[PDB]
Amino acid sequence: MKVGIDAGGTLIKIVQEQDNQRTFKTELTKNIDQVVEWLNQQQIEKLCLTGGNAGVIAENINIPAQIFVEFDAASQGLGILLKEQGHDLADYIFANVGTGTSLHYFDGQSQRRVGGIGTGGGMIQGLGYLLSQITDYKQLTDMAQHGDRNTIDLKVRHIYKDTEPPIPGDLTAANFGHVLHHLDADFTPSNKLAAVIGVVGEVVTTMAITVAREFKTENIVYIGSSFHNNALLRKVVEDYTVLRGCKPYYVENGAFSGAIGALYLE
């Protein structure tokens, strides 16, 4: 058994390989001690680590472990997954929407980090909590899928009214910009959470399309566990990527790109 681990800020992704049978396992980073205990009882032929919490694992386990930089690991694993799933992309932006968001240009050969932003899954959870008091991820995301953003977000057409706007009227002009115009109207937990997801999605996508233009690629691959149990986030991102003339791709087990990559790096 070969094991790759991407121990990130919020989730630990574990890939176990045995004779080309893969196991994909998610654990909370808060439960890292259990991952360590588990590892110490396993028969491991090779162990590769990546992510911010790789060191916490390495220092507490009884076996050697190779450690890799998460950006290279993510790129390597993502390339593997893309090819397995029948995407032959000459080049692409990849946006890793984790606790935070890291943006990369893959030129066909190697990755380069071309940007990043603190709008990601961490913000969804944290700001989500401040606005709703919900700490449970599944509960938080499920609720948001039922939300309406109309009373919260301001569109271009709301600013331009009955005049022709210089960019499309349906675009978000200001996230949370309708709130002060709806002070009688209600800001239900679902509606508020949908708007949080909305801003995070729009920001990530905006950054991704911008660097896509900069590096002259139309392909944008979105990965990260922030897309799990969040159809709304996937939709916000997908729709706006398409609107901007780019091609969005999601990847089966994309959140495990780093963990897979760690196993296959030299």
Ligand X SMILES: Nc1ncnc2c1ncn2[C@@H]1O[C@H](COP(=O)(O)OP(=O)(O)OP(=O)(O)O)[C@@H](O)[C@H]1O
Ligand Y SMILES: COCCCCCNC(=O)CCNC(=O)[C@H](O)C(C)(C)C
Residues tagged in the binding site annotation for ATP: 6-13, 99, 121-125, 137, 225
Residue closer to its own copies, measured from CB, 86 or 166: 166
Strands 46-50 and 11-18: unpaired
Asked whether position 225 contacts ligand X by CB under 6 A, the answer is yes
70 is catalytic: yes
Asked whether position 121 contacts ligand Y by CB under 6 A, the answer is no
Asked whether position 119 contacts ligand Y by CB under 6 A, the answer is no
Angstrom distance (rounded) from CA 266 to CA 239: 37
- Give the nearest residue (CB) to ligand Y: 116
Catalytic residue among 17, 70, 84, 266: 70
Asked whether position 222 contacts ligand Y by CB under 6 A, the answer is no
Q: How far is the CB of 93 from ligand Y (least distance, A)?
A: 14
Among 12, 95, 207, 260, binds its own copies (CB under 8 A): 207
Phi first, then psi: what are they for 193, rounded to 5°?
Answer: -65, -35
Asked whether position 240 contacts ligand Y by CB under 6 A, the answer is yes
Asked whether position 258 contacts ligand Y by CB under 6 A, the answer is no
CB 202 within 8 A of CB 154: no
Q: How far is the CB of 24 from ligand X (least distance, A)?
A: 12
Note the helical H segments in 42-188.
54-60, 70-84, 121-132, 137-145, 156-160
Angstrom distance (rounded) from CA 101 to CA 247: 19
Q: How far is the CB of 225 from ligand X (least distance, A)?
A: 3
- Residue 204: strand, helix, or coil: helix
CB 254 within 8 A of CB 222: yes
Contact residues: Mg ion, CB under 5 A? 8, 98
